[PDB]
Design a protein around this ligand. Structure first.
Ligand SMILES: *c1cc(F)c(C(=O)NCc2ccccc2OC)cc1C(=O)Nc1ccc(C2COC2)cc1F
Lengths: 13, 253
């Protein structure tokens, strides 16, 4: 959930 | 009274934009997955995992991208692929017109609450009643072999199969799914969104594009549009149950 958000922000940048 | 007019052409151009992006973001399409599952491809025949011996043989003979107990090793391969899927779905979301122009916090919220619904939509493409394609089509793990894994792992994938068997009976293709998945991502009802109206405006245009896609592509299902909105409703409940299983597992394993 924190993990999931971290991966999404990484993939978005 | 449907007409081929500037508005309809713009909706077909949006549909083609999404299809092309879907093909780019998702290596194994439903077309290619169905070809593998029905033995109608010239590509390599998947290795079948149907019991503990063929799993042990498969761990060698199938080439996984990731590097104790069987149920946990399988769950960890599942966890790795899910990380890769979040990246692919994110890359797709960035191609949906208007998405990257939303507030970043809203882009993050839409993906956070949307990726699991898209994961089990796209898993259905890789499933038949027998089992699921794994390792980009190099392997096939049976539904019953997965159910035979000890609690709580044996019941992890079974609701996704139940969903898939009914979903796959609608015979959607990649052109249909590309728009379906975009509609799911642009849901203005996700918790904690800052600016809902610009998300609903994009979703409205995607709903128009989906409706037109399904009328042109599915002459013998006049209410397929309504049936797919019903499935988006069902995916909500499936993901509620999935996050409950994840909590048990993260805690106790
Ligand atoms: C298998 C195991 C598993 F634990 C998850 C999962 O939901 N993990 C939670 C999670 C934690 C941290 C970051 C991201 C997370 O989830 C995305 C999911 C799965 C699973 O469904 N794996 C999987 C297999 C195959 C595919 C195919 C590619 O398109 C269908 C997707 C996929 F996610």
């Amino acid at each position: 959930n924190m993990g999931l958000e971290a991966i999404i922000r990484k993939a978005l940048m | 009274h449907m007409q081929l007019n500037p508005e309809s052409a713009d909706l077909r151009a949006l549909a083609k934009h999404l299809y092309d992006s879907y093909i780019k973001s998702f290596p194994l399409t439903k077309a290619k997955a169905r070809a593998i599952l029905t033995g109608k491809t010239t590509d390599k025949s998947p290795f079948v995992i149907y019991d503990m011996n063929s799993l042990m043989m498969g761990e060698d003979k199938i080439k996984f991208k990731h590097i104790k107990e069987v149920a946990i090793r399988i769950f960890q391969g599942c966890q790795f692929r899910s990380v890769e899927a979040v990246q692919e779905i994110t890359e797709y979301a960035k191609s949906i017109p208007g998405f990257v122009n939303l507030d970043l916090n809203d882009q993050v919220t839409l993906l956070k609450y949307g990726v699991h619904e898209i994961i089990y939509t796209m898993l259905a493409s890789l499933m038949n009643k027998d089992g699921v394609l794994i390792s980009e089509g190099q392997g096939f793990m049976t539904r019953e072999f997965l159910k035979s894994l000890r609690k709580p792992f044996g019941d992890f994938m079974e609701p996704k199969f139940e969903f898939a068997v009914k979903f796959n009976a609608l015979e959607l293709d990649d052109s249909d799914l590309a728009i379906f998945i975009a509609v799911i991502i642009l849901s203005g009802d996700r918790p904690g969104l800052l600016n809902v109206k610009p998300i609903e405006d994009i979703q409205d245009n995607l709903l128009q594009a989906l409706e037109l896609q399904l009328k042109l592509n599915h002459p013998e299902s006049s209410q397929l549009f309504a049936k797919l909105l019903q499935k988006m409703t069902d995916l909500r409940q499936i993901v509620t149950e999935h996050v409950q299983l994840l909590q048990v597992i993260k805690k106790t394993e």
